[PDB]
Nucleic acid binder design. Structure first.
Ligand SMILES: [Mg+2]
Ligand SMILES: [Mg+2]
Ligand SMILES: [Mg+2]
Ligand SMILES: [Mg+2]
Ligand SMILES: [Mg+2]
Ligand SMILES: [Mg+2]
Ligand SMILES: [Mg+2]
Ligand SMILES: [Mg+2]
Ligand SMILES: [Mg+2]
Ligand SMILES: [Mg+2]
Ligand SMILES: [Mg+2]
Ligand SMILES: [Mg+2]
Ligand SMILES: [Mg+2]
Ligand SMILES: [Mg+2]
Ligand SMILES: [Mg+2]
Ligand SMILES: [Mg+2]
Ligand SMILES: [Mg+2]
Lengths: 90, 76, 183, 98, 172, 169
RNA sequence: AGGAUGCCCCCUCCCGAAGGAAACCCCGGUGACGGGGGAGUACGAGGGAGGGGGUCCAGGGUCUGCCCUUACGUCUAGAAA
RNA sequence: AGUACUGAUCGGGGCCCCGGUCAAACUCCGAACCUGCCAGCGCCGUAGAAGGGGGGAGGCGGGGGCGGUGGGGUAAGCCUCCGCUCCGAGACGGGAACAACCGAGACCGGGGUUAAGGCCCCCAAGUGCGGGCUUAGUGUCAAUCUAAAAGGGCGUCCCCCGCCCAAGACAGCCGAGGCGGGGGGCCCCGAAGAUGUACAGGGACUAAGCCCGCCGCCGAGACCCCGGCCCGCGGGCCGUUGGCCCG
């Protein structure tokens, strides 16, 4: 089963930003979540996304619900995932 | 994410006040159109939205909306 | 510089993404505003719920004001019934007029595409000036009735007001030449 | 059963009058003087039915060709065929429309 | 005096099985083939005709730049020959854009000269002499939504407004 | 009598001018207003229930009579004739016809089949429209359950779907 | 009795109607995808020029694969009947 | 529409008044709409409008769709009228097949783009996108075409109203929601046939079903383009019972 949780690093599999990495920062409902690249980092804008269009990775950072990009970027440093985000899958 | 209180009525004489969780009023209205269209066979022209307003989670009536607000994870 | 891009309507499919692209290539940083529940694009400024005391903060913070006025503005200027109900102008008209006039007063940059120039003309902000408009019979007449000199160029700049015929038929070079012009 | 064709064969509605028009009609239609070239409208008066033209000519516009004693000779058309209607002025009205 | 708006009308549905009263009106509007297009002045007598054929055509306000492109690509003169810039200049029109603007703005009340029009000497005619009074368009690239439903409920028929220019560009 | 489906739909013009109809049948409904009909005593009643037609169609006279009997009997038994007013609101004006071979009904009726097909009178019906009130009841709010039951029984006798509307006077 | 100055392949070159992409960069959308650039480009019915290689080409008999396809004449509103 | 003339018809109140039910052979009112004349627009017309004369007919069995509750009839792929269109006398794409349903009008060859309709396989193009519903293989994108009613079901999803509970409500002290009514969506029962399988194209599908929306693509002889041919009309040249050229 697919599990999407706040802080999880995910990969987008649909849309122009396909193959890019992103961080889940909020939950809208059972079907949509909010992800942020951060944009300056991986090229993913801060938008809602349907769960069907993302796949979870094995990496997770710790943040609060609705975390800002700077808070996300800082948490990406305490985990050392900065170069993990710039890599494009497939 | 916010709870939107949507007040509306239909050409078929039905009235409704529902609470829908969404990012923006546009997303909440899309859920209202598709769900009412599904559950009552109502075309979008037959649905008249009269009022959309944010309601704080403390004062909402729907436990569905409250529970979505505090969700930390989803499963598919 | 920062530009505020008011997305009144999206019925013209490519108007907003094209206008934003040109402004970004023109060096601006674009903040998107929305004043109606029917617009589907992401935005950071909610002109529907923004209090009126916060307006003076808005004029100071932005150097340009662009209006993605699709067919909603077109049928409001003509005072005509649109073929679709979604093309009705469902925004706060008084706030919109207040925004345009105030930005114009502080001599900030105004980008008026398609039928927006006729809306600015009806506000009396282009009397005696050169402007272009979406060249249909009725819109050309409205410009002339408001003492505006119609010019048949794609992009026309009158000293702080840039008017374009149709952003979807405007090349990047033409738009950027007028952005970099002097006014 | 086939349609019968008496001279007045489907004229119940046409020859009926509302209560407010009962009785004699006014005499002003008698006093119009038509010259050749005038345009008239055939408006049948049911109180003088024996001199009225056929129902098919009600509402048609004709041109006055001349006079015959007290009747006016009117040139009109039924579809594409030229017809000559000879009738008295009580069944005529002036056509002001040209 | 009064300058009526200029409309573009495109015939979207075909000839066989068209009702008689609609077929007659389309013929008088010069839309005698499918995907034929005309530009008309929107006088009340003309608008009464468009209402009659509303379920067979689509129409809207045409803009001068779209008309300029239509003339350059699908404009034909007598003999079914292409309309060229040189032919315009011989008659005193400097460009496709100028004549299109003259017609849309109301400076001239007709785009193609009438059958009985007589060209003078030196004087620029108030139309384009011997231009065929109709355009034969290409089918729309990317298709339509539905030729059986009105544009107002998601089809393609009837009044389209300024979106007729988007459709024309796809049909050029 | 034929099955009522044979005369349910409105297929032609109303046929009611009895001065042009030979042998038009007599109406077989004895009363149309039941219970307490005097206007003074009806002022005590403060509720109104209506059996409303949902479709257009023709209701035969015997179905109206069957519906009138079952509802009025129920109200008489359970509510009491002094505590309600019931009115059959429509009158069977329309005359029904049938094309059958018969004796003692005219010489043309002796020709078989569709020759001389215009039928002889066969009954009466009421032509009703959607939303039209078929039965009308005035009652006291304490008897609401009984009045709804009486109208449910009336509806089971009628050839078209109906619905019960309860409103105050 | 027809062509063999042919036909076929390859390569190169020129022109080219209607029409017309892609990689990739940028803007939008949850998204299927849209738009600006790349680009009216690569290409495109066909029309021209040359070079290398081969041997028959056209036409015919018959069979196979794929696609299409309801004997004829007749009266009839209606024929595979 | 009205119930005022002519008639029909149910109640209340004192032959009158009030409320109600009706009318092909009733009408105070009264549309949409059709139609006459004039002016204009639009189109056709001097390459010949109107009008007139002459020769030859065929044909004088029609039919389909949709609309007039047309009128009749239990109904009919029924009988009999009125109007637009189509078949007859019309190719071609779609509809599983199928004169007349949808699309559309075919000189011949080639290129391109669309229409109806479709895009899991058969079969060209999506195992396309978001939301919701159904558990019955229900169902599987209009009609011809193979179906279904009154009625029953909180089966399940949803909307509204009334009342109780201010934690002393409902169910048998406990502690939080509870009881009733009206309606809507899908599905279940109602639902029974004769050569051969959940028939309505087959495989099969839990979506490849249904509802509210959306994106792209495929797809005719239609539309666009190129080449070839023929035709109507007009013009020209040639000693012509005819030939050739041009627009
Ligand atoms: Mg006769
Ligand atoms: Mg006499
Ligand atoms: Mg058709
Ligand atoms: Mg009938
Ligand atoms: Mg030889
Ligand atoms: Mg035979
Ligand atoms: Mg036979
Ligand atoms: Mg045969
Ligand atoms: Mg009535
Ligand atoms: Mg008539
Ligand atoms: Mg006959
Ligand atoms: Mg017929
Ligand atoms: Mg025959
Ligand atoms: Mg077929
Ligand atoms: Mg395939
Ligand atoms: Mg039935
Ligand atoms: Mg089944």
């Amino acid at each position: 089963v697919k599990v999407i949780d706040v802080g999880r690093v995910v990969v987008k599999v649909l849309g122009r930003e396909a193959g890019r990495k992103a961080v889940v920062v909020d939950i809208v409902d059972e079907n949509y979540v909010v992800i942020t690249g951060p944009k300056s980092l991986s090229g993913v804008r801060r938008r809602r996304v349907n769960i069907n269009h993302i796949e979870p990775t094995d990496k997770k950072i710790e943040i609060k619900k609705g975390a800002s990009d700077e808070e996300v970027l800082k948490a990406l440093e305490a985990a050392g995932l900065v170069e993990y985000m710039k890599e494009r899958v497939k | 994410p916010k709870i939107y209180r949507v007040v509306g009525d239909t050409s078929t004489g039905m009235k409704f006040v529902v609470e829908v969780v969404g990012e923006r009023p546009y997303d909440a209205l899309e859920k209202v159109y598709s769900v009412l269209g599904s559950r009552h066979k109502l075309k979008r022209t037959q649905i008249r939205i009269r009022e959309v307003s944010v309601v704080e989670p403390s004062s909402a009536k729907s436990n569905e909306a409250k529970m979505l607000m505090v969700l930390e994870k989803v499963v598919r | 510089p920062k530009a505020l891009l008011y997305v009144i309507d999206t019925a013209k499919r490519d108007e907003y993404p094209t206008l934003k692209n040109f402004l970004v290539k023109g060096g601006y940083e674009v903040d998107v505003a929305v004043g109606s529940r029917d617009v589907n694009v992401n935005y950071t400024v909610d002109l529907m719920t923004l209090p009126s005391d916060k307006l003076p903060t808005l004029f100071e913070e932005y150097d340009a004001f662009a209006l993605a006025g699709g067919f909603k503005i077109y049928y409001h200027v003509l005072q005509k019934k649109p073929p679709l109900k979604i093309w009705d102008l469902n925004i706060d008209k008084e706030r919109l007029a207040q925004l345009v006039v105030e930005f114009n007063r502080r001599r900030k940059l105004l980008i008026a595409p398609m039928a927006v120039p006729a809306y600015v003309a009806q506000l009396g902000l282009l009397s005696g000036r050169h402007a272009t408009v979406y060249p249909v019979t009725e819109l050309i007449k409205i410009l002339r009735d408001n003492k505006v000199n119609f010019v048949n160029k794609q992009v026309v700049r009158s000293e702080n007001i840039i008017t374009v015929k149709d952003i979807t038929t405007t090349s990047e070079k033409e738009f950027l030449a007028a952005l970099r012009e002097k006014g | 059963v086939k349609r019968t064709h008496g001279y007045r064969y489907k004229s119940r509605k046409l020859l009926s009058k509302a209560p407010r028009e009962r009785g004699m009609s006014g005499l002003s239609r008698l006093l119009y003087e038509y010259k050749p070239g005038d345009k008239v409208v055939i408006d049948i008066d049911p109180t003088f039915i024996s001199t009225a033209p056929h129902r098919r000519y009600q509402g048609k516009v004709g041109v006055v060709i001349g006079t015959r004693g007290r009747a006016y000779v009117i040139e009109t058309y039924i579809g594409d065929k030229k017809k000559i209607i000879i009738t008295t002025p009580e069944h005529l009205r002036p056509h002001l429309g040209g | 005096k009064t300058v009526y708006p200029r409309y573009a009308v495109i015939r979207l549905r075909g000839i066989p099985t068209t009702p008689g009263d609609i077929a007659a009106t389309l013929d008088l509007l010069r839309l005698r083939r499918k995907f034929t297009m005309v530009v008309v002045v929107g006088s009340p007598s003309v608008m009464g005709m468009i209402e009659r054929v509303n379920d067979w055509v689509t129409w809207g306000e045409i803009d001068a730049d779209t008309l300029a492109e239509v003339l350059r690509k699908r404009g034909r003169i007598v003999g079914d020959k292409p309309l060229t810039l040189e032919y315009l200049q011989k008659w005193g029109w400097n460009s496709f854009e100028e004549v299109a603007l003259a017609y849309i703005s109301g400076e001239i009340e007709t785009l193609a000269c009438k059958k009985d029009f007589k060209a003078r000497e030196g004087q620029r005619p108030p139309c384009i002499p011997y231009l065929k009074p109709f355009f034969r368009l290409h089918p729309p690239r990317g298709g339509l939504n539905s030729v059986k439903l009105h544009f107002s409920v998601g089809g393609d028929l009837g009044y389209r407004g300024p979106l007729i220019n988007d459709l024309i560009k796809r049909m050029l | 009598a034929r099955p009522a489906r044979c005369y349910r739909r409105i297929k032609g013009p109303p046929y009611t001018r009895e001065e042009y109809i030979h042998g038009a049948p007599m109406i077989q409904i004895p009363k149309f207003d039941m219970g307490t009909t005097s206007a003074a005593a009806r002022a005590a009643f403060t509720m109104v229930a209506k059996l409303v037609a949902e479709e257009r169609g023709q209701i035969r006279m015997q179905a109206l009579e069957a519906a009138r009997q079952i509802s009025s009997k129920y109200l008489t038994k359970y509510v009491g004739d002094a505590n309600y007013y019931l009115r059959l609101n429509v009158v069977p004006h329309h005359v029904l016809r049938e094309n059958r071979m018969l004796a003692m009904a005219g010489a043309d009726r002796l020709q078989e089949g569709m020759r001389l097909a215009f039928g002889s009178p066969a009954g009466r019906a009421a032509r009703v429209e959607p939303g039209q009130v078929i039965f009308y009841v005035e009652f006291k709010p304490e008897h609401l359950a009984h009045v709804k039951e009486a109208l449910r029984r009336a509806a089971s006798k009628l050839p078209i779907p109906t619905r019960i509307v309860v409103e105050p006077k």
